[PDB]
Amino acid sequence: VLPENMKRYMGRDAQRMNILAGRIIAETVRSTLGPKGMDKMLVDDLGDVVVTNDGVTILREMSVEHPAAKMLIEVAKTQEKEVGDGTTTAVVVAGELLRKAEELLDQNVHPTIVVKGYQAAAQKAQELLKTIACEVGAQDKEILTKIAMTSITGKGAEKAKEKLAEIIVEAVSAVVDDEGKVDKDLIKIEKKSGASIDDTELIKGVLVDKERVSAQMPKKVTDAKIALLNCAIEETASEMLKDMVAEIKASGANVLFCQKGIDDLAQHYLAKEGIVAARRVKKSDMEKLAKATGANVITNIKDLSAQDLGDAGLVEERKISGDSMIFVEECKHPKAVTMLIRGTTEHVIEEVARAVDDAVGVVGCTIEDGRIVSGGGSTEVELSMKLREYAEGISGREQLAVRAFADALEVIPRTLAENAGLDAIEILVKVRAAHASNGNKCAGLNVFTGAVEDMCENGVVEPLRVKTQAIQSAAESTEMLLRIDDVIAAE
Amino acid sequence: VLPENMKRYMGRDAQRMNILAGRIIAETVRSTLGPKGMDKMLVDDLGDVVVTNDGVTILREMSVEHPAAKMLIEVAKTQEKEVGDGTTTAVVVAGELLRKAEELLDQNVHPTIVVKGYQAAAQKAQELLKTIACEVGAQDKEILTKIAMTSITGKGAEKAKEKLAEIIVEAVSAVVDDEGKVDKDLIKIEKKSGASIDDTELIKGVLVDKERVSAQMPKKVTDAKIALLNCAIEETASEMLKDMVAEIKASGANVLFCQKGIDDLAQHYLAKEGIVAARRVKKSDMEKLAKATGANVITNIKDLSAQDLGDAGLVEERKISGDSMIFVEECKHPKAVTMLIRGTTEHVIEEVARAVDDAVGVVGCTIEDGRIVSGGGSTEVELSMKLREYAEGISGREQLAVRAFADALEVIPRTLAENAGLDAIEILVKVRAAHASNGNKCAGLNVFTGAVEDMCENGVVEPLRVKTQAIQSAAESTEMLLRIDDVIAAE
Numbered sequence A, B: 001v002l003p004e005n006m007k008r009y010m011g012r013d014a015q016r017m018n019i020l021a022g023r024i025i026a027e028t029v030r031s032t033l034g035p036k037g038m039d040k041m042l043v044d045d046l047g048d049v050v051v052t053n054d055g056v057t058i059l060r061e062m063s064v065e066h067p068a069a070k071m072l073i074e075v076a077k078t079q080e081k082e083v084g085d086g087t088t089t090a091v092v093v094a095g096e097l098l099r100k101a102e103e104l105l106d107q108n109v110h111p112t113i114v115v116k117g118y119q120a121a122a123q124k125a126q127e128l129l130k131t132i133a134c135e136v137g138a139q140d141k142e143i144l145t146k147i148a149m150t151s152i153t154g155k156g157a158e159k160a161k162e163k164l165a166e167i168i169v170e171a172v173s174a175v176v177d178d179e180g181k182v183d184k185d186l187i188k189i190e191k192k193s194g195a196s197i198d199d200t201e202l203i204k205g206v207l208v209d210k211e212r213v214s215a216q217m218p219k220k221v222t223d224a225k226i227a228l229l230n231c232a233i234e235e236t237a238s239e240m241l242k243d244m245v246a247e248i249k250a251s252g253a254n255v256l257f258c259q260k261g262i263d264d265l266a267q268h269y270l271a272k273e274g275i276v277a278a279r280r281v282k283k284s285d286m287e288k289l290a291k292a293t294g295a296n297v298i299t300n301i302k303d304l305s306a307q308d309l310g311d312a313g314l315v316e317e318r319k320i321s322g323d324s325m326i327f328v329e330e331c332k333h334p335k336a337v338t339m340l341i342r343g344t345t346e347h348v349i350e351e352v353a354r355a356v357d358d359a360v361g362v363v364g365c366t367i368e369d370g371r372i373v374s375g376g377g378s379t380e381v382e383l384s385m386k387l388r389e390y391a392e393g394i395s396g397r398e399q400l401a402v403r404a405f406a407d408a409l410e411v412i413p414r415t416l417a418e419n420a421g422l423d424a425i426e427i428l429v430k431v432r433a434a435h436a437s438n439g440n441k442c443a444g445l446n447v448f449t450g451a452v453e454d455m456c457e458n459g460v461v462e463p464l465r466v467k468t469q470a471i472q473s474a475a476e477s478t479e480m481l482l483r484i485d486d487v488i489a490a491e
Helices: A011-030 A055-061 A073-078 A089-107 A111-118 A120-132 A141-147 A168-174 A240-245 A264-270 A283-292 A348-363 A377-388 A401-409 A411-418 A426-437 A465-473 B012-030 B057-060 B074-082 B088-094 B100-105 B112-128 B142-148 B161-175 B265-274 B284-290 B348-359 B379-387 B397-419 B426-435 B463-475
Strands: A041-043 A050-051 A189-193 A201-203 A227-228 A256-257 A317-319 A322-327 A337-343 B041-043 B049-051 B224-230 B254-260 B319-320 B323-326
Touching: A011 A055, A011 A089, A050 B142, A055 A073, A055 A089, A073 A089, A073 A465, A089 A111, A089 A411, A089 A465, A111 A120, A111 A401, A120 A377, A120 A401, A120 A465, A141 A348, A168 A189, A168 A201, A168 A337, A168 A348, A189 A348, A189 B074, A227 A283, A240 A264, A240 B284, A256 A283, A264 B284, A283 A337, A337 A348, A377 A411, A377 A426, A401 B049, A401 B397, B012 B057, B012 B088, B012 B100, B012 B254, B057 B074, B057 B088, B057 B112, B074 B088, B074 B463, B088 B397, B088 B463, B100 B397, B112 B397, B112 B463, B142 B161, B161 B348, B254 B284, B284 B426, B379 B426
Parallel strands: A189 A337, A227 A256, B224 B254
Antiparallel strands: A041 A050, A201 A337, A317 A322, B041 B049, B319 B323
8 A cells, every 4th residue: 555665654643753853953943042042063974073053054964864854944944045044033933833733733623723823823923023113214324233233143243233233334325226125245244363343444445365466566556547357368478478468558557456367477567567466366356346446347358458447546465464465445436345354363254244244134124124123022022912812803713823823922032031041921021011012112032131121222123024034934834844644754 | 276475365364454455545545635635745765755635646656565455546546547636536435435345244245235236326326416417508607617616626726716717718618619529738838927816817829938049030020920840940051051041031930930940050040031930849839839820830941831821919029037938929710728827936837737727627528518516515415315215215235235335425525524623413414404405506515614505606616527437436446346355465
């Protein structure tokens, strides 16, 4: 009757295997979300040994056995590539969810009915998540720097947060054309040693990774006409390589970045005339230096010409913490802007590089939705006491659906209390009571002193595409995994 | 007396082996049919994980042990080649039927007897299944949509049932010649993203997934003379390839679709005159472009010529969902018709394409056969109560067998009760009672409210192709399988 891999589990047998798998990797992930947790150390196979707190990776490495348990990576995985933030959230409440869906299924529910609850309480939840929404519109600066600070919390520096959420709002407020499309690609993040957390600056242009070629070429130009060649100023020795260099100084460059190198004796001519030049320079390089400086990007070094060519307000080669790089400031029309990040080690620079990228992301969310929620746990307790009262509206089995799915929304505000060594059942009361009466806004779980607070007036708050995706893609993922009743296993 | 590998079973020994092999099988797949059916998770040696509801590939895969047990995919396998519908039917009430034929076999009686009831209860079944007939005409609209929607139930969308059914009945009622006959190959099924459920349409013609070869070619032709050139437009570079193109523009091709395509230089000749072309277009989008436009399909290009030639109102290359496709509407004489289909992903599409193709197979039989019946258990419970009082008719052994074959028909209707988690006892007396009385179209078992139900007056009803073959194929399978009673075994 079957063959090829076959040991077979319906009903109880089934329950066990899909609950244990999903419970598992929740426990995994429970104590990594927000201010109150904690670090994990992986090791595979290659005996290789790897500290991390962040949920995707964490289930990536760990070669899994449970196939059912494999379909749950899948649901943290599609929350990182998309939005980013909330890996954690989508998933954890995807295992909790399921525990609670066990108590029932042991009431012999018709798995039928329990889904007929958590669907109509997904849906309603949409109508809830949308109103607690405390609308503040798109380019208001106050709030931009409260969505940006929350882009920077639980992090190796949330400290900076006020200087990492400023030159960020200036750098996305400066990129986006026709209010309501929201571009990342544009904001590069360079990371150099020396400073503090607050000496991060926003050069209206492009800061690349580039020496001066020829030691010839003046180490700084004033009002410079930067060229872009993506393609060859290599030909083989004497003549060819002279005709390429005397045609750059024919058109109008002082400044040249070529994605395709330089020889010796051709930088000697470049520096003969007062032309500086930057070798090997990356095509990442190229496009940024194009919108910085103002450039239309060419093919070769042989089309290089002042007209497809830029305008730039200072251009020095600056050695910065024992490495040379090329700056390109005062930029006329930056689409797209680089933010210099001063910094600790490469590790706190990188992070203030990621505490902008996911800041520009998340504000490219308050362009397209200029909603703002709910200071982490906040909107949960609100959804709580609404959707409880929603339940007294359904009737039948779907009663017992929607009640359970509210009371498991208290999962996340709970653990972030517990992790915090707090009395849960006091605060819960504190926050719930203060949310029905203040609003969206006001109604928080602050870690610190331990009591309900204005994540708003702090503000401490996060974008709205974050909360939205994290809950939907999670919620419907764990009702798939709900619903397979029959496991015939095998490799 | 018997080789190698040996071991031998009758009666006790046997009956248990067979039955086991029977029942397991069934147990498996019972809980999968109807409103109420649950997925399954296969896995082979290879490692490959696999999620499927449908009986055939269920038993396909799962590499089975017992050679009697092998005789049991044969019986879901035939049911899928012919109609499709019902795989689950034939089979499950194949192995139930075997459970109850156990009670009597341990009764001692004469298999000979048991069979002797089951064949008269087949044949009188026939007489009952052509009365519960609620008979309409075949090219009516009402009952065309009912057939249509009952081809589109327990599925991915069931949803768009009513939109799914509209454009399928106008696609069938435009195919058929000489109201008797109900061809399938004339209805293509094109799948793109963008839309909702209800907005899928019926292009009186053919839509192919090919974009314009040559980027001179005019991107839109008004009153166009489509060519069909299966041939080679392939010659060696220069000359031979030109007078191949210059022979298209001689004829009166505007518009040209080649089964083998177009080199280089040829494109840029095509595109120089005004002639659009589509390269490596299958034999499939050949055929249906033929019927689409009106063409007679030809050998080569060099034949592609005015009269073998078509009439289409509209031919634009329109990027849809991302992707660029060639439309071919305004179709004078479609014998055969595309039906453009918008939802979701890949997946909601390809389902609406499969919820049409079964919808063109089961309207190809109320052409067939003229004739309607009531899903999920009008016909079963009605057989029940009639075949029951046909027992007290018969006298003998046969008694015993006709009773057990009726009470077996309570099977299906009842599981779909249990699976909704309702009470089967109170329903089955309500729908029996309702069906004696009101009629063959009207005594149902709606899972949703729970209660007996005018199939007919909702619009949930199924073809005839359908219940006819699924009860035949299955009945006389699983009494044949009764009747081997010795098992000598080898590897």
